[PDB]
RNA sequence: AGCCAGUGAUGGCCGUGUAGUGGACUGCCAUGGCGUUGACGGGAGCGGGGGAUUAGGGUUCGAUUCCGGAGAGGGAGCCUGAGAAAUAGCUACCACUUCUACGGAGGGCAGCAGGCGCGCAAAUUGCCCAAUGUCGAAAAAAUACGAUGAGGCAGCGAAAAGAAAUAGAGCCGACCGUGUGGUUGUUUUCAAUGGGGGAUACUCAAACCCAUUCAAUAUCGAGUAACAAUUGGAGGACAAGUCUGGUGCCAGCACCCGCGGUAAUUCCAGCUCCAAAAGCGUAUAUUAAUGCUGUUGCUGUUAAAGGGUUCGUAGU
RNA sequence: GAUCUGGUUGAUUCUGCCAGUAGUCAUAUGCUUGUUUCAAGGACUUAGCCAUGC
């Protein structure tokens, strides 16, 4: 019900400053602790080397193999799981080859049916996922 | 100007000074003081809750910038 | 399983592009473009993409 | 001027071909001819001078 | 890096990228007035804007207020000078009252057409650009270009075109060579 | 949630030191000084003028051109000077590091250009003092031309911003939908213009770009104008197909809802169509959407949320 | 521009979030690129290390 009370702005203050850490998005922005569990160091894409090609299984109302890989970033050494798009595009993708990484379009939240993935590649060999798959280029 | 917080030292005496600071966003006041240590000459007598007026003089001490000029 | 990759990609039947005469460009595409619609016909709702009948 | 039959520029008139010769920069005489000769370029001048910097008395120290 | 030369826009993009009412409206003005792309409309769009902006400002203010009367008659004088409101309209409550179909009508694509020197605003937009049409005896080849009231009865070919006094065009000059 | 005092913490007296005031410092004396109006400690961070988003109130960014501060690998000391605790000055140590005849002697790009490494991530080892300034025994010229990677100029540069081409006007024939006009198509004619090529030349320190011109007696050029527009989409949000093949819960799409098991409006393609266009997608951060942080301006019986009850200080 | 839309039910009216939408002299990457004017350009990570010339 508030006070207002023309010389209680000390009291205002103080009530949005503690109130202030009850929204998840005022308090992530403000926190540094997901940064640091960011496989991305508060970047937008990262670099790494390719580890395993693992297919992983579609959630329950759907039903396909998703076709990902395992990847390993150069900056950190951390390990994370990256979709591949497209029809085919896995064939473009060898093992130890270099890859580069981007989100997906949720800010760290999974998308789609894919189970626990964030991730998706966006160039191999520093040529270009899609410009592979159009034919434009061809794989160094 | 100042009130006579506390006579306690030789020749020095602490002032304080209650202001009311204005907030924009909440268009309203709040309560703000400090505190001021100054010389006080022996032809002056202030005791706690007394007003004073003081002067700028040149540094005098660690802490002290002011000299007493009138009690009220 | 990984086996089955690129299988529909891979399996559609090549057909060719058609050449046509190109289109005009930059103002005269927006008069092309504005003929279509309030020209070249007299209604007293057009659909822009009306298709045959089919099954 | 665009698209047009005009130009304009500005322009001195001395009172001497003494008085020109005096006064004018150096290359707006030499775009007449009658211009002082070209100097080296600087970089030579640049390396002469750092290596003297180690020489004393005579051989240009 | 030490550079001071000023650049700002002239244009933002509409909010709902995708309505049917403004979609239709805004192609029939680009068919109507021979325009290039829909910038040329959101380009207008601002200049109103501001106007507008601005006269909402001073009708607030008190009247006889010291702004009011500097800059309400300037903003007046330059309505009046460029064509946009007649001489009748004088209480700069008239300045709230413009549309975008009033500034179209002082483009230089406009006014060739209207003065009869073409017989299209598609052939109107080409002679500009091709350095046929004089102002006040300066060539003018923006089609963009606002005309004043003071320079509407100037328009006319430039002698330098082969339209007006100039020297016959590539296609007779090819074919004279040809000869 | 308490901080400060052996070894200065707060104040006093006589001094020392400084260019000068001062617990700045030596000796003696008293017990003071600060704090829920948040001290002490911790985290992020050079401060401001200002930028972004604009009903209003607000939220957020500011290493970076101007002003102020600090530093020259780390950290300490110092000489000369009117001014430095100076680093393209000196001295020593630590970490790196170069030449040697092995006795010794050197180094400091967070100046310009350039290299390695790092990373998602950023240009030439170019020309010139012509302009703007600084220093100086110094105007310019004449037996007789200061320096200046400060600065300017060009190269590279789809960060961002402004203007703007990719066609115009008709005849004929066959068609269109309203009901002698509005327009689509193929054989056609007839003017115009740049992108380009050049110059008596202009510009410029010189060169370049722009601008002028294709006779002033005397200057090249568009027809499939092959001088050929792209990037995303067509179930809904959201503008645009109940079209035709292929695949058959596979391959794949899908920000969300969802599509795909034999007639797929959603996948892979063809043809049409849509948006905006020399630009257009994707990722991350941030502002508005958000009256989902609410001073203006939220909610609290049952959706999340009134303390078990009284007394009661600071505060209002 | 003082503006909102899709998802909870066999249907209805709510609370509430997730998703959509516009800008950024705001960075990076992909496809494409005819003309002209004006411009930022090794800050982010490593106040990391430096051949050569000035
Ligand atoms: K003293
Ligand atoms: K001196
Ligand atoms: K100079
Ligand atoms: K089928
Ligand atoms: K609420
Ligand atoms: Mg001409
Ligand atoms: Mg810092
Ligand atoms: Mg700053
Ligand atoms: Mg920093
Ligand atoms: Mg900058
Ligand atoms: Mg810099
Ligand atoms: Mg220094
Ligand atoms: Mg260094
Ligand atoms: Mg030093
Ligand atoms: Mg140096
Ligand atoms: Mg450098
Ligand atoms: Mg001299
Ligand atoms: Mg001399
Ligand atoms: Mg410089
Ligand atoms: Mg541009
Ligand atoms: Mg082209
Ligand atoms: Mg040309
Ligand atoms: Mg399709
Ligand atoms: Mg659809
Ligand atoms: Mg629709
Ligand atoms: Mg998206
Ligand atoms: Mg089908
Ligand atoms: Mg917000
Ligand atoms: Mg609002
Ligand atoms: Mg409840
Ligand atoms: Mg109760
Ligand atoms: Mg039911
Ligand atoms: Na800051
Ligand atoms: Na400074
Ligand atoms: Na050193
Ligand atoms: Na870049
Ligand atoms: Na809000
Ligand atoms: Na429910
Ligand atoms: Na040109
Ligand atoms: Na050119």
Same mark, same amino acid.
């Given at each position: 019900?508030?006070?207002?009370?023309?010389?209680?702005?000390?009291?205002?203050?103080?009530?949005?400053?503690?109130?202030?850490?009850?929204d998840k998005g005022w308090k992530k922005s403000?926190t540094?602790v997901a940064q640091?569990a960011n496989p991305f160091?508060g970047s937008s894409?990262? $670099?790494?080397?390719?580890?395993?090609?693992?297919?992983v299984?579609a959630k329950?109302?759907?039903?396909?193999?998703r076709?990902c890989?395992?990847?390993?970033?150069?900056?950190?050494?951390?390990?994370i799981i990256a979709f591949?798009?497209?029809?085919?595009?896995?064939?473009?993708?060898?093992?130890?080859?270099?890859?580069?990484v981007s989100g997906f379009g949720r800010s760290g939240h999974a998308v789609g049916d894919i189970p626990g993935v964030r991730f998706k590649?966006?160039?191999?060999? +520093?040529?270009?996922? %899609?410009?592979?798959?159009?034919?434009?280029?061809?794989?160094? | 100007?100042?009130?006579?917080?506390?006579?306690?030292?030789?020749? +020095?005496?602490?002032?304080?000074? &209650?202001?009311?600071?204005?907030?924009?966003?909440?268009?309203?006041?709040?309560?703000?003081?400090?505190?001021?240590?100054?010389?006080? +000459?022996?032809?002056?007598?202030?005791?706690?809750?007394?007003?004073?007026?003081?002067?700028?003089?040149?540094?005098?001490? $660690?802490?002290?910038?002011?000299?007493?000029?009138?009690?009220? | +399983?990984?086996?089955?990759?690129?299988?529909?990609?891979?399996?559609?039947?090549?057909?060719? $592009?058609?050449?046509?005469?190109?289109?005009?460009?930059?103002?005269?595409?927006?008069?092309?473009?504005?003929?279509?619609?309030?020209?070249?016909?007299?209604?007293?709702?057009?659909?822009? &993409?009306?298709?045959?009948?089919?099954? | 001027?665009?698209?047009?039959?005009?130009?304009?520029?500005?322009?001195?008139?001395?009172?001497?071909?003494?008085?020109?010769?005096?006064?004018?920069?150096?290359?707006?005489?030499?775009?007449?001819?009658?211009?002082?000769?070209?100097?080296?370029?600087?970089?030579?001048?640049?390396?002469?001078?750092?290596?003297? =910097?180690?020489?004393?008395?005579?051989?240009?120290? | 890096?030490?550079?001071?030369?000023?650049?700002?826009?002239?244009? =933002?993009?509409?909010?709902?990228?995708?309505?049917?009412?403004?979609?239709?409206?805004?192609?029939?003005?680009?068919?109507? %007035?021979?325009?290039?792309?829909?910038?040329?409309?959101?380009?207008?769009?601002? /200049?109103?804007?501001?106007?507008?902006? /601005?006269?909402?400002?001073?009708? /607030?203010?008190?009247? &006889?207020?010291?702004?009011?009367?500097?800059?309400?008659?300037?903003?007046?004088?330059?309505?009046?000078? %460029?064509?946009?409101?007649?001489?009748?309209?004088?209480?700069?409550? %008239?300045?709230?009252?413009?549309?975008?179909?009033?500034?179209?009508?002082?483009?230089?694509?406009?006014?060739?057409?209207?003065?009869?020197?073409?017989?299209?605003?598609?052939?109107?937009?080409?002679?500009?650009?091709?350095?046929?049409?004089?102002?006040?005896?300066?060539?003018?080849?923006?089609?963009?270009?606002?005309?004043?009231?003071?320079?509407?009865?100037?328009?006319?070919?430039?002698?330098?075109?082969?339209?007006?006094?100039?020297?016959?065009?590539?296609? $007779?000059?090819? =074919?004279?060579?040809?000869?």
């Amino acid at each position: 019900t508030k006070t207002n009370g023309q010389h209680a702005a000390r009291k205002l203050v103080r009530l949005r400053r503690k109130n202030r850490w009850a929204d998840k998005g005022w308090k992530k922005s403000h926190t540094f602790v997901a940064q640091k569990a960011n496989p991305f160091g508060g970047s937008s894409h990262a $670099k790494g080397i390719v580890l395993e090609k693992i297919g992983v299984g579609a959630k329950q109302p759907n039903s396909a193999i998703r076709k990902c890989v395992r990847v390993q970033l150069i900056k950190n050494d951390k390990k994370i799981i990256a979709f591949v798009p497209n029809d085919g595009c896995l064939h473009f993708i060898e093992e130890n080859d270099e890859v580069l990484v981007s989100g997906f379009g949720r800010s760290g939240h999974a998308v789609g049916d894919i189970p626990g993935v964030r991730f998706k590649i966006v160039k191999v060999s +520093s040529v270009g996922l %899609y410009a592979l798959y159009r034919q434009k280029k061809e794989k160094p | 100007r100042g009130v006579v917080h506390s006579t306690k030292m030789r020749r +020095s005496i602490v002032i304080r000074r &209650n202001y009311l600071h204005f907030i924009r966003k909440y268009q309203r006041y709040q309560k703000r003081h400090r505190n001021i240590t100054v010389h006080c +000459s022996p032809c002056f007598d202030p005791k706690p809750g007394d007003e004073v007026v003081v002067g700028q003089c040149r540094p005098l001490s $660690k802490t002290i910038r002011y000299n007493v000029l009138q009690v009220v | +399983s990984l086996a089955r990759a690129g299988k529909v990609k891979n399996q559609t039947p090549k057909v060719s $592009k058609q050449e046509k005469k190109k289109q005009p460009r930059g103002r005269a595409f927006k008069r092309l473009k504005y003929t279509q619609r309030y020209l070249a016909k007299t209604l007293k709702k057009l659909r822009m &993409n009306k298709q045959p009948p089919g099954k | 001027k665009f698209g047009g039959g005009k130009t304009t520029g500005f322009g001195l008139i001395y009172d001497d071909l003494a008085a020109m010769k005096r006064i004018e920069p150096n290359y707006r005489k030499a775009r007449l001819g009658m211009g002082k000769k070209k100097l080296p370029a600087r970089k030579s001048v640049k390396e002469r001078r750092n290596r003297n =910097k180690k020489i004393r008395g005579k051989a240009k120290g | 890096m030490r550079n001071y030369n000023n650049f700002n826009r002239v244009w =933002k993009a509409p909010r709902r990228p995708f309505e049917k009412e403004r979609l239709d409206r805004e192609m029939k003005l680009c068919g109507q %007035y021979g325009l290039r792309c829909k910038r040329e409309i959101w380009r207008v769009n601002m /200049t109103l804007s501001k106007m507008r902006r /601005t006269a909402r400002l001073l009708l /607030t203010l008190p009247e &006889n207020h010291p702004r009011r009367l500097l800059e309400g008659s300037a903003i007046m004088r330059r309505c009046h000078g %460029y064509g946009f409101l007649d001489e009748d309209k004088d209480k700069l409550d %008239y300045v709230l009252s413009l549309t975008v179909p009033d500034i179209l009508e002082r483009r230089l694509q406009t006014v060739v057409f209207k003065h009869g020197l073409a017989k299209s605003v598609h052939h109107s937009r080409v002679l500009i650009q091709q350095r046929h049409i004089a102002v006040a005896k300066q060539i003018v080849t923006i089609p963009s270009f606002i005309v004043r009231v003071s320079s509407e009865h100037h328009i006319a070919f430039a002698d330098a075109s082969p339209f007006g006094n100039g020297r016959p065009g590539r296609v $007779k000059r090819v =074919k004279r060579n040809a000869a």
